[PDB]
Design a protein around this ligand. Sequence first.
Ligand SMILES: Nc1ncnc2c1c(-c1ccc(NC(=O)Nc3ccccc3)cc1)cn2C1CCCC1
Ligand SMILES: [Ca+2]
Ligand SMILES: [Cl-]
Length: 425
Amino acid sequence: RIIVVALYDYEAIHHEDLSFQKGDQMVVLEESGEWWKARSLATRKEGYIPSNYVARVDSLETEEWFFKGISRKDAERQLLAPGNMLGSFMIRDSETTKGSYSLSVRDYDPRQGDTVKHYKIRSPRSTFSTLQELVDHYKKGNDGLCQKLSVPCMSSKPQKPWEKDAWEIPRESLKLEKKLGAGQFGEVWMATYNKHTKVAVKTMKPGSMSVEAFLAEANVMKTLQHDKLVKLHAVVTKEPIYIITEFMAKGSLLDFLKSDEGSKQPLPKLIDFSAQIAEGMAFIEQRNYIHRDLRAANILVSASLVCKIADFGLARVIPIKWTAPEAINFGSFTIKSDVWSFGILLMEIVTYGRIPYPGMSNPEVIRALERGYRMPRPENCPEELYNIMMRCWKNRPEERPTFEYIQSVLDDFYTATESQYEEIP
Ligand SMILES: Nc1ncnc2c1c(-c1ccc(NC(=O)Nc3ccccc3)cc1)cn2C1CCCC1
Ligand SMILES: [Ca+2]
Ligand SMILES: [Cl-]
């Protein structure tokens, strides 16, 4: 008889799902993925609950200061997001000591700025019974920490999982309310699914993109979910093909960088964007795929300033200034040619969306590349960041770095390796 408890309030929006409040417990009846059949103990109603909204009772996730499955850098990102302050903290699974837990605390530093310090856990000069007591002490005066614990890190509701068994949907479920962009193969619309969920919808123009073959690839992309790739929610099988993805409130990185909220983003933020994108490419790199069209226009920014690679699968169904010479001349697109593109993307970001090689036509650009030309360095781009672009722009593909390496460098750009975790007496 399994029992769970609710971490956040939830309003039912479908037919068979339950409403529940933060703290309500319920008996688990069926475990079938993102949705669980359960029986609320507060209402006695049976129905479906989003499985990521609940945790086993008396387990660590029930605590407001615990954060399951969070990397050191994610913890750094979450702690630095608005709503937090000096002393804000969390306890999470250690990324390196795979089985133990670490502490992450927010600090201010007059030179650097707002920072996040990480402390490993099991100082020998302190024995607390379990993790709760540990928290309890450091809240009243630091026992060595660079700052003393104030409040747990702000946490917001997870994204609602898509409706169960609603991968193939009828067109009737959608109201496409606003055309966001048009192009060669169709349009992208801001839409509403069953009057309750805001989504984005890619409407396809039919071509050699064979129906039952286009849908084959979309099914592939649906297996390749990652936090840094845009969620594939649903599909409409009948021509013209509709692709339903999650809505990204701030649109393209290109447009967002050109905006006024964009022109306020400091360099550490721009690099953070780059790090997110490289994490997405690193996932793709690991799975042995290729994006083939990496650039700022194909990156989406969420409302919370999270950057995701806008899929990516469009090359499995169908701009040389972003393209490596090897793929331009012989059509040899690889993960290494994306690296080149990423380097160009990197320049876009630092230049707030300024078009690459400004003032040069395509052939101008190509012959310049063969000469050995590369874009110069903007009067705000760091030498060490520029050096990364150059390494991406190596003429021989095999000498360009991996995304795995690129991600690790951008992630800790301002942090010496020796300074990742603090070390206490
Ligand atoms: N999701 C969004 N949310 C908010 N705004 C969005 C978008 C998108 C958007 C961009 C790319 C896609 N691509 C996509 O779904 N590709 C795909 C997925 C599976 C199989 C084949 C292709 C979908 C929506 C585009 N846009 C705006 C429209 C033009 C600029 C940004
Ligand atoms: Ca140290
Ligand atoms: Cl019961």
